[PDB]
Design a protein around this ligand. Sequence first.
Ligand SMILES: *[C@@H]1O[C@H](CO[C@@H]2O[C@@H](C)[C@@H](O)[C@@H](O)[C@@H]2O)[C@@H](O[C@@H]2O[C@H](CO)[C@@H](O)[C@H](O)[C@H]2NC(C)=O)[C@H](O)[C@H]1NC(C)=O
Ligand code: NAG
Ligand code: NAG
Ligand code: NAG
Ligand code: CA
Ligand code: ZN
Lengths: 178, 328
Amino acid sequence: SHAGTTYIFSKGGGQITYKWPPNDRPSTRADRLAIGFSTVQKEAVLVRVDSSSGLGDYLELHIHQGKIGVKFNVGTDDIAIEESNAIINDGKYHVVRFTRSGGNATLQVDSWPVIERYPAGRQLTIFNSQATIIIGGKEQGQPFQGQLSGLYYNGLKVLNMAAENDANIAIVGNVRLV
Amino acid sequence: CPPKCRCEKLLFYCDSQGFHSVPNATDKGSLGLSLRHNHITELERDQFASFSQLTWLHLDHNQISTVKEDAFQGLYKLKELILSSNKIFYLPNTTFTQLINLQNLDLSFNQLSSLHPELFYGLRKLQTLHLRSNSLRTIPVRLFWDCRSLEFLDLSTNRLRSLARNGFAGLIKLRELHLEHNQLTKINFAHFLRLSSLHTLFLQWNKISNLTCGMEWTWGTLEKLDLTGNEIKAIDLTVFETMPNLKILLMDNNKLNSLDSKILNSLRSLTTVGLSGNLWECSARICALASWLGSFQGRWEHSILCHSPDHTQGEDILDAVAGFQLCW
Ligand SMILES: *[C@@H]1O[C@H](CO[C@@H]2O[C@@H](C)[C@@H](O)[C@@H](O)[C@@H]2O)[C@@H](O[C@@H]2O[C@H](CO)[C@@H](O)[C@H](O)[C@H]2NC(C)=O)[C@H](O)[C@H]1NC(C)=O
Ligand SMILES: *[C@@H]1O[C@H](CO)[C@@H](O)[C@H](O)[C@H]1NC(C)=O
Ligand SMILES: *[C@@H]1O[C@H](CO)[C@@H](O)[C@H](O)[C@H]1NC(C)=O
Ligand SMILES: *[C@@H]1O[C@H](CO)[C@@H](O)[C@H](O)[C@H]1NC(C)=O
Ligand SMILES: [Ca+2]
Ligand SMILES: [Zn+2]
């Protein structure tokens, strides 16, 4: 049960990217990422938000050993959170939700216990000047193979925007809008 | 009682009627007169000669453009005069001098460009003076020489370019001074030396670049200083030595880059501070500020955020200090 705007990432790799205007690259104290997907892969990179040139800040959503997880960096250090209780590469539809509040993070697989992770001490709270959203994980050398639907990032329905041929969007590789 | 006017007592309420001049009065023993929101365009000589016993007179929101000499003559008992929201641009030097018992004078929202150096002479019982929202560019050195009991002065929303050395002579009892929304460039706090009773000073939304203090002195009564929304980038290391009892200091939305520990060591009586929106450089330089915050026991309404270098932008100072190993 998977309906919504969806893209097929088949063999050979694929990539959907969004380019923010140079001046308006946003900074955020909190982040809300929700993606609908289905896959059978053991290892892949779904979405990655990279900061503008000259900044180490980043946010990456990926599958590793069939387990969905998130890794992010405010500036100083890498923070990781993963659903290790179970597996999501069974080929069925899932919605994973990621939530960031400064150093804090939240992961929840569809209809499973919510994962909450709180860093010790005081952390940097700002993800700094986001430049691109790279859906596909081709450039990371782990292209994703499957179906992606209803991607949500900070109020942006990015896939829906790609299906509307938004000028900024750049579609490359073997990706089809079924 | 004169036509179109309802009178509750000796008080005459003639607001919101089409009056182009002051009506002649059957009863000349009136205590108060209200002529608000009419279309009076001119004030004649001895116009209120009939209303000798007037204590308050409201002439706000009229198109008054010309005020003849001796316009208010004979109003010895008048203690409140409201002339705001008009088109007054020139005032004869003798226009207020007769009104001795005046306590509240409002000349705000007018087109005054300059004031006669002897305009406010002999207003010793004056307590409040509203000159807000005028186009004054300069202010006579002797204007407030006779204003002995003035304790509230409003000069906000004008076109004041800079402050005279001793313009304030005779404001020895002034408590609250409004200078916001003008066009000041620099502040030499020695210029306020004569205001020895001031508790609050508003200087926000000017174009202030520098904070200096030419003469060493102690301004023991000043408790609140609002400098919000200027362009302050530099501050002499002794300007806050002057204000030992300063308890509220607001410096948001400026171009402050850092603060010397010499500065911050004088600001210890503070209960409220404001340092947001500044161009803070997040490096070892802010340690003076960072340490102070740990030491500080007062309040600050808004969070203080780094502006430089870029990787620290928008992040609270202390979070960035401890996060990037900037100090200690
Ligand atoms: C990130 O989370 C921290 C800590 O989360 C707390 O721990 C959990 C057990 C749960 O009880 C959470 O609700 C707690 O908030 C937050 O730091 C706490 O913030 C609250 C509210 O501001 C405060 O009452 C606590 O004292 C704080 N604890 C510490 C150790 O500082 C922090 O606010 C979160 N950051 C962001 C950006 O949301
Ligand atoms: C009103 O007063 C003026 C003088 O100010 C006088 O010339 C005029 O006759 C008066 N009119 C009435 C009706 O009293
Ligand atoms: C009024 O102004 C004139 C300027 O022409 C000045 O010489 C005179 O002294 C002033 N009178 C008073 C009483 O201030
Ligand atoms: C303010 O001080 C700075 C350096 O302290 C100086 O360069 C500048 O000229 C001063 N501003 C004015 C208006 O004198
Ligand atoms: Ca950052
Ligand atoms: Zn009219």
